[PDB]
Amino acid sequence: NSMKNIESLFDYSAGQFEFIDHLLTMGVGVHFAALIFFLVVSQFVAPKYRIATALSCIVMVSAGLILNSQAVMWTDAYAYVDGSYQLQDLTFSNGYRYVNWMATIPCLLLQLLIVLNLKGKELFSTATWLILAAWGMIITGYVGQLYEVDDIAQLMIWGAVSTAFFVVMNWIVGTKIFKNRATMLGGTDSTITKVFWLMMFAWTLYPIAYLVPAFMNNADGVVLRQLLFTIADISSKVIYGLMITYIAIQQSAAAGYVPAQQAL
Ligand SMILES: CCCCCCCC/C=C\CCCCCCCC(=O)OC[C@H](O)CO
Ligand SMILES: CCCCCCCC/C=C\CCCCCCCC(=O)OC[C@H](O)CO
Ligand SMILES: *C\C=C(C)/C=C/C=C(C)/C=C/C1=C(C)CCCC1(C)C
Ligand SMILES: CCCCCCCC/C=C\CCCCCCCC(=O)O
Ligand SMILES: CCCCCCCC/C=C\CCCCCCCC(=O)O
Ligand SMILES: CCCCCCCC/C=C\CCCCCCCC(=O)O
């Protein structure tokens, strides 16, 4: 996997190499800082919605561990030699992020469906189609990036296939949001629409990073990709979870849960 990603193709200046290392370790801290937040405010969420804030804690730790894993893989694979960081070992690859997504994306979708107040047959039904569409998306994406060095045309046709799953997934999500937002309490029918558009923007950065190999094949493409992943991660995982949490509490208060009312 290491040799199949463009990170292995280049030497990095100390500035590039440390910028990337600082992006990843910063991502670690941010996710684990938010984890503590998500842990604390759980007591202010009615039992109905408490699972939602719990799923954020799962996403936070899942992301934080992969980012910490990549931060160390990054420093193990390169040594500063003759004024540049040069690959020493094949211990770094992006495929671990795609593992981070296989695991976190189901949690991210499920917390959305919970605050939409879906239940029973529909919740289980909608979650199954969304998770399968999502996995098809990630899986065809993982296959394609195995070729980002050797066969760009394969990266492209696997991206096209992956994008079909993405579009179908978004249509299901958007359709459920707009048909069930009338059930949301505390005015959260207005906030959930902003969440959907937040999702649309943040999730679309990943395919943009995915394509960096095809239009910026150089050490600055590598830096740019990690910068895009960092913005996307922070937006699709942290900010998203915060808003999901805010909707969970607001609906808990509107439903008579007192710890939510006092907290607000
Ligand atoms: C390369 C493979 C082909 C690529 C071609 C891409 C086509 C782009 C079309 C739509 C964007 C998909 C996002 C769907 C946005 C949400 C849809 C939605 O929510 O529908 C509203 C609902 O009908 C109200 O009740
Ligand atoms: C490095 C840190 C970055 C990681 C993020 C830092 C943690 C929280 C930041 C902003 C929260 C604002 C968004 C949350 C809005 C609703 C939360 C809420 O209602 O909290 C109830 C009250 O605070 C309980 O006492
Ligand atoms: C960390 C949370 C999320 C939701 C990550 C989301 C990732 C995607 C939406 C990835 C999408 C891709 C597409 C549409 C086609 C290129 C392959 C990717 C898997 C990067
Ligand atoms: C970088 C994060 C550092 C934050 C300060 C460290 C102190 C430990 C963190 C949180 C304290 C526990 C929060 C409990 C919430 C109050 C619940 C209540 O009012 O009953
Ligand atoms: C635990 C992860 C496995 C999940 C299985 C169920 C979801 C799979 C969804 C669609 C997978 C499409 C894969 C395309 C086949 C080509 C991959 C290959 O060449 O090995
Ligand atoms: C990620 C979304 C999918 C991107 C859509 C792109 C559709 C394919 C467009 C034209 C394919 C042309 C392939 C020729 C390039 C291969 C050889 C080369 O790059 O030098």
Distances (CA, A) of 232 to 24, 173, 208, 245: 13, 19, 10, 19
For the CA of 43, the nearest atom of ligand 4: 17
CA angle 155, 88, 213 (to 5 degrees): 20
Can you tell me the distance from the alpha carbon of 263 to that of 113, in angstroms, rounded to the nearest whole number? Answer: 24
Residues 85, 92, 89, 1, CA torsion sign: negative
Q: Are 58 and 94 in contact (CB under 8 A)?
A: no
165 CA distance to ligand 1 centroid (A)?
11
Q: Are 238 and 63 in contact (CB under 8 A)?
A: no
Can you tell me the distance from the alpha carbon of 211 to that of 117, in angstroms, rounded to the nearest whole number? Answer: 37
264 by DSSP, 3-state: which? coil
Counted domains in the chain: 1
172 CA distance to ligand 1 centroid (A)?
9
Q: Are 21 and 84 in contact (CB under 8 A)?
A: no
Tally of CA atoms within 13 A in the half-sphere of 263 that contains its CB:
21
Q: Are 252 and 244 in contact (CB under 8 A)?
A: no
Amino acid (1-letter code) at residue 83 = G
Q: Are 93 and 142 in contact (CB under 8 A)?
A: no
Mode of pairing for the β-strands spanning 84-87 and 78-81: antiparallel
Q: Which residue range forms the structural domain that includes residue 230? A: 1-264
Q: Residues near 113 by Cβ (< 8 Å), separated by ≥ 6?
A: 123, 126, 127, 130, 176
Q: Does residue 131 line the site of ligand 5, with CB under 6 A?
A: no
Q: What method was applied to determine this entry? A: X-ray
217 by DSSP, 3-state: which? coil
